[PDB]
Curated annotation (Swiss-Prot):
InterPro entries: Ribosomal_bL19, Ribosomal_bL19_CS, Ribosomal_bL19_sf, Translation_prot_SH3-like_sf. Pfam families: Ribosomal_L19. The lineage of its organism: Bacteria, Pseudomonadati, Pseudomonadota, Gammaproteobacteria, Moraxellales. One of its GO terms (biological process) is translation. The gene is rplS. Keywords: Ribonucleoprotein, Ribosomal protein. This is Large ribosomal subunit protein bL19. It comes from Acinetobacter baumannii (strain AB0057).
Length: 117
RNA sequence: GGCCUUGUACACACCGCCCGUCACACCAUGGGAGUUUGUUGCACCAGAAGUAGCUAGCCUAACUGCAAAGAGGGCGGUUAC
């Protein structure tokens, strides 16, 4: 809430209200709307959350995965309608907010320990 | 020119035979800056399915228990090859 109240009201008018709770280090699945022609479908994007930005309607989060041997990252915008659904598969236990050190690790070295209840 | 003996790689029989360099043509081959294929010895990295061990996170028909539960099992995690 570092913006003017009018901007805050205009932004708050468009907030999603069913977002789950997740943190860096968690592995998540994102259902992404894909529209070609008149054809609509949901594509799954599963991976580790390596960064989270809490900025109200300007919130974002970065998901990293290994796809066919090639690392790929996507920075989703949390309140965008293209993000249909987010599910948390497993909760991770980490020591810092940003996990960029994972980019230089491969295989067993990049494993994230599960957070035990 | 004629007889005996002797040496000979000559027998078209010394107007014999025959060797090497240089020139011409053809063939196979050695060396050679490098270019390239296969295979292999060490050292390290990564590492599937599978097998062996550990683990106590989650889920659970046959057995025990009136029931909470227990035993057993499965999924997962983890190490070695």
């Amino acid at each position: 809430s570092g913006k003017h109240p009018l901007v805050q009201a205009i932004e708050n008018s468009q907030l999603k209200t069913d977002l789950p709770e997740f943190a860096p280090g968690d592995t998540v699945v994102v259902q992404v709307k894909v529209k070609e022609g008149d054809r609509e479908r949901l594509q799954a994007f599963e991976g580790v959350v390596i960064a989270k930005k809490n900025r109200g309607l300007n919130s974002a989060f970065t998901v990293r995965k290994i796809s066919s041997g090639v690392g790929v990252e996507r920075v989703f915008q949390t309140h965008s309608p293209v993000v249909a659904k987010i599910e948390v598969k497993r909760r991770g236990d980490v020591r810092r907010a940003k996990l960029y050190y994972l980019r230089d690790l491969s295989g067993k070295a990049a494993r994230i320990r599960e957070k035990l209840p």
